[PDB]
Design a protein around this ligand. Structure first.
Ligand SMILES: CCn1c(C(=O)N(C2CC2)C2CC2)cc2c3c(ncn3C)c(Nc3nc(C)c(C)s3)nc21
Length: 289
C-alpha cells in the first residue's frame, strides 16, 4: 500500500480533471522491467484545501471493494501525495464507445448500464454521493466489464440528512446536474440517479458530437446565451419539462428509464436497485433469456 516514488517509472499522461491528473506508470522496484503498470492520480496544483479533499477521496476509494469500482492499490508520499490505482487498458467508456460504435450493440450497452447501476448501488450502501456520473468517468477493464473510475467529487452524506449541499468553485458539469443541484447545490442518491439517466442517454447516442448533452441543451436554450445566463436558462428549461430527446435507434423502454431518472420530483426518481432489475429484465427479453 506504500509505493516509493523512486520506483514509479512514468509511461504516459492518461487524462486531466479540473484539479487532479492521471498518468500511466510502471512500478518497477527491481528495475528489471517486470513491475506492474499502475494508474497514478496526482494534484495538478498542490494547495491545502485540494490536499485535504484528495486525502478524503483516497479514504473513500480505499473503503470501496466492488467489481465495478476501480481498485485502490496504495499511496505515494514524496506532501506530494499520489493515489495508486489498478491500470485499466481500454480507457474511458466515452472513448471506447466512440471507437467501437459499429461493433457495440444495445444488449452490450445494457450490460455496461447494469454494471454502472450495481457499482452505484454499492456507493449508496456506504452513503457516498458520486456527484460526477458521466461516461468520461467510467473506465473499461475489458469488452465485458466497466468500472466507476474516479471519485474526485464524491461526498459522504451527513448521518442525519439524505442530501449534501456543496458549491465547488470553478466550472461544474451542469448538463449532467439534477435541477435541485443547479438551484440549491443539493446532492443526493436521487441527483446521482438523474446523472445516471444522462449517462444512459450518452451511451445510446454512441457519443455523437452533435448529440452530446451540452450540444442538445445549448440548442434548446439558444447558442446566443452568455455564461451565468446558461445556468438560469437551463433551470427554466428543466422546470418546464424540457428534456434531452430520445437518441436515434433508442427503444422506447430505454428512453422511458431515462425520462423517469429525469423527474423534477426528487422522491419520484427510481432507485439504483430498481434500475438494475429493469435493465436486466430488458437485457433478458432482448436475449430471449
Ligand atoms: C480517461 C483517462 N483516465 C483517467 C482520467 O483521466 N480520469 C480523470 C480524473 C482525471 C478518470 C476517469 C475519470 C483515469 C484513468 C485510468 C485508466 N486506468 C486506470 N485508471 C484509474 C485509464 N487507462 C487508459 N488506458 C489507455 C490506453 C488510455 C488512453 S486511458 N485511463 C484513465
Amino acid at each position: 500500500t506504500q509505493f516509493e516514488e523512486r520506483h514509479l517509472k512514468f509511461l504516459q499522461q492518461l487524462g486531466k480533471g479540473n484539479f487532479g491528473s492521471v498518468e500511466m506508470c510502471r512500478y518497477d522496484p527491481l528495475q528489471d522491467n517486470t513491475g506492474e503498470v499502475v494508474a497514478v492520480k496526482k494534484l495538478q496544483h498542490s494547495t491545502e484545501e485540494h490536499l485535504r479533499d484528495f486525502e478524503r477521496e483516497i479514504e473513500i476509494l480505499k473503503s470501496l471493494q466492488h467489481d465495478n469500482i476501480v481498485k485502490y492499490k496504495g499511496v505515494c508520499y514524496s506532501r506530494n501525495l499520489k493515489l495508486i490505482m489498478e491500470y485499466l487498458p481500454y480507457g474511458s467508456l466515452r472513448d471506447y464507445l466512440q471507437k467501437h460504435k459499429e461493433r457495440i450493440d444495445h444488449i452490450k450497452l445494457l450490460q455496461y448500464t447494469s454494471q454502472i447501476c450495481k457499482g452505484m448501488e454499492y456507493l449508496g450502501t456506504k452513503r457516498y454521493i458520486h456527484r460526477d456520473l458521466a461516461t468520461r468517468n467510467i473506465l473499461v477493464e475489458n469488452e465485458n466489464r466497466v468500472k466507476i473510475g474516479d471519485f474526485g467529487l464524491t461526498k459522504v452524506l451527513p448521518q442525519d440528512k439524505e442530501y449534501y449541499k456543496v458549491k465547488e468553485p470553478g466550472e461544474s458539469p451542469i448538463f449532467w446536474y439534477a435541477p435541485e443541484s443547479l438551484t440549491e447545490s443539493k446532492f443526493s442518491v436521487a441527483s446521482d440517479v438523474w446523472s445516471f439517466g444522462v449517462v444512459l442517454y450518452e451511451l445510446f447516442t454512441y457519443i455523437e458530437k452533435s448529440k452530446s448533452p451540452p450540444a442538445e441543451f445549448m440548442r434548446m436554450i439558444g447558442n446566443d446565451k452568455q455564461g451565468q445566463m446558461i445556468v438560469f436558462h437551463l433551470i427554466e428549461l428543466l422546470k418546464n419539462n424540457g428534456r434531452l430527446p430520445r437518441p436515434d435507434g433508442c427503444p422506447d423502454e430505454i428512453y422511458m428509464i431515462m425520462t423517469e431518472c429525469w423527474n423534477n420530483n426528487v422522491n419520484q426518481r427510481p432507485s439504483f436497485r430498481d434500475l438494475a432489475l429493469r435493465v436486466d429484465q430488458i437485457r433478458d427479453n432482448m436475449a430471449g433469456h
